Amino acid sequence: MADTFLEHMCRLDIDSPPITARNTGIICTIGPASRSVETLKEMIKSGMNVARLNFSHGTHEYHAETIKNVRTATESFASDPILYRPVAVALDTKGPEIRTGLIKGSGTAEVELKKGATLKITLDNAYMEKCDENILWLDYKNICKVVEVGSKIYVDDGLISLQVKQKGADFLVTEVENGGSLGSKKGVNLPGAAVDLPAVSEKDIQDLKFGVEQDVDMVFASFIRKASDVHEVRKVLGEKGKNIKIISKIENHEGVRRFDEILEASDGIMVARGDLGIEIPAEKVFLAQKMMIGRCNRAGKPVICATQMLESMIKKPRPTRAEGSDVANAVLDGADCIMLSGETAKGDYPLEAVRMQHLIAREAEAAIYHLQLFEELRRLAPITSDPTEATAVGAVEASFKCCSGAIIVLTKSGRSAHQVARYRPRAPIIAVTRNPQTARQAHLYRGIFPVLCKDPVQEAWAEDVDLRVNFAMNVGKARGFFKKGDVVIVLTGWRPGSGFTNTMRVVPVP
Template identity: 60%
Template sequence: MVSIEATAAFLKELETVSYYAKDEKQAVLSKATYLEHLSSLNITEPPHAVRKTAIICTIGPKCNTVETLACMIRNGMNVARLNFSHGDHSYHAMTIKNIREAAKVVKHENIVAIALDTKGPEIRTGMIMNSSTAEVELVKGKSIRLTTDPSFENTGNAVNLYVDYKNITNVLAPGKIIYIDDGLISLVVDEVGSDFVICTIENGGMLGSKKGVNLPGTSVDLPPVSEKDIADLLFGVEQGVDMIFASFIRNGSAVCKIREILGEKGKNIKIISKIENQEGVLNADEIIKASDGIMVARGDLGIEIPAEKVFLAQKLLIAKCNEAGKPVICATQMLESMISKPRPTRAETSDVANAVLDGADCVMLSGETAKGSYPIETIKIMHYICKEAEAAVYHSKFFEEILKRVKKPTSHVETIGVAAVSAAKSSLASAIVLCTTTGNTAAMISKFKPSVPIIAVTKNPQTARQLWLYRGVFPIYYSESEKLPDWTKDVDLRIREGINFGKEKGFIDTGDNIVVVTGWTSGAGKTNTLRLIIAD
């Protein structure tokens, strides 16, 4: 067993000890400053042997067959995202079945998580001229009347346009901006009436039916979940999904409402709150506290706040999650051009890399895989970018800064996390291998972003799938059904399974130091023992 005091010597050694990433096949001196670290980067060095940042892929018509899904898993997909803004329950049930079938044909990588992304509460326009395909041109400089009068719901035109948010007249004021259709059309409010808002068209264009409406900088009182969301969440519980990506979360109470809906049967489902408006950013602390993780949803966020502010929100939210030890996903338009092209732009590759350098645990593909022409190629490109970026992360400084923010006295799991990362660096270990029931120990070690992989062996299949949310964690589902009477022997077999996985992946060799984290007895919450062993 270890204590926080026992790690003090390790921390002192960090200032002088050289450490290396095993897969780079050479020692790399830990630089004293971030500037020194950056100036020592070498573009000719090979990347890490394994990728630590998880890849989330949105599943759509272009990639929902068993064969394509299996190929996506082999090439790096860790979490399959189902977008419930599209498709009915029968379609999503079929897709879930296909994902699970595809996972069966792949070995260690068959631990694939399934995420349900809710449509969320939203504001939309009505129909244009009683047709789902009709369009009307909104001309710059002209006036248009937005109304909540239901008599206009299906008869929208360039003069009168229905919106389905009844309280819009109470939250808007002259001078406010309204965006329609992902910001392609913008209006400026001139006058607010009892059931209408008169606007000047600032940026015009062709407008179709049922388009999304954004009110940037305006606090709205939409319900945290819609009736559709409730039905979808209950469907997800029945289907056994691993995580919920909850759309348009504005405050912590919205997360609590979703937990209430998931109920006892869905209590172990992770809730990842999507922050995609100014209110969500301003309430980030309470949302992070109430959630299991956060998604920086840059699509709507880039409409709700000025585009030039999105990178600030990204860095802010990732930093807050890193400090809290909550996983964070960076999403939207990461490799957007690959929807139709086989290679990304230089700006896109830098965007993905910088998300990794910022501290994102996962990166997400949306239309690139859901409807793109090159889903497999896109995953491969993202895989390679992440590996290169991870090799440039300044692990020592990150560890020191996170450690300074840890409140004393530490919990036993946090103490173990600090000690494991310190021991790995000081001993030049090739990996940290642990046994876990709930995944809490693996998550805590991941918080300190060690430079070596964290191999988490668990007998709980859902825990294994959910651990993809954490940077550097490689979950292994230990499916051995026979429970050995000797608990110590059983633990040793699980640790052996983890070491063998590391050998297969090429980052553990015979003779390497390995940090092992286990409990002193069986059961959840018992992890308190750290050992340093040599791989044989």
């Protein structure tokens, strides 16, 4: 809108209402607070696009029923194919974690840790359910190999910290620095160590194969360190799960250093700030986020900002001021998807969290300085002569001039719609598809609003197109994206077949 970024900031207006559409994808983690079919229905209406299953906790039976509930709540809306919203299922792997043992005692399963006190760490399975003030167990077998005297051991997602004083053959005497209440099977981080667990562990092969059987849409592979880790996960999914999108989670120092080879192998990225903020200094996480989002935008691949975006909303019904700014800034940085972990999995206000996510994202979109964003994306794009790319850039450029309410894209594999999203247009991308997996996986991309055409293929191609285009027109009028008499962009082929979406059309809305 304005000639400089500084004037663009100065022009930002609280009283200027945002567009009804919301481009940024929302990913909610399912758990105790959101597992029920009636709650899942409300989360879908509130704005959920992808349900994340965290395989660091549940059994296969538990997760199987969580999937069952999600599809019940999803297909609840299928009676009306206009207002039907696809909902993806995502399997977040355990990965090479270090979790502690269980706690001994009555009342509750917790014990205090004084600042300055001693705590012996052990690998002996006799203390596997007898962790307390003095002794502590953890499942990583080679912990004495990778650790030295003075090394930090962070327990329970950063809260508690320990410095190693002495070593044994298989035991470590440590001194407590940050106190607090220890619990059962809390996560442990070893910043400075080189943890040598397998990227695809024995448990993870079972969880992935289960993912293929359950027909999940994507896999959030944890603690990805290098490009070979992504190919290991690709192999385990194999032929049958070839179409399952692999999103590499960057959770550690090694993963940041090797980001380019990891991005090359992966379908997308998750900036998993949780583990990253322990493994790397807290100041710096933003550097890593902005870098990874930046490179993913340039590469044209989905990137997900994740964890602790609305942490206070576990306990409270409204977010903090910092949590408000974090979500907005992640969207302004250019993140395709925002994520909620504990907020929806085990929180007292799951629905309010999903709505805040929707609300902030929706006018972070408005505050994007599109003039500069689009200018720079063209320059930094390679000079390939793929007809689908050139149509996409034409569509996006066309959309900025005739302030379009939408860009409608007929697509089988999603790729035609992905390439439009790559250039970050202001208008939403109504991706029309008969492939239901394509509709679900499209949530990963910023601004793609998938719609599933359940209708049978009409005889003539020319009339089959017009049905899918008019189907999208009806969805756009229904959602408020545009009205009768407005202008929109339409992307179709020349005789059908996945591979050549080469036709842009500026159509008046009927």
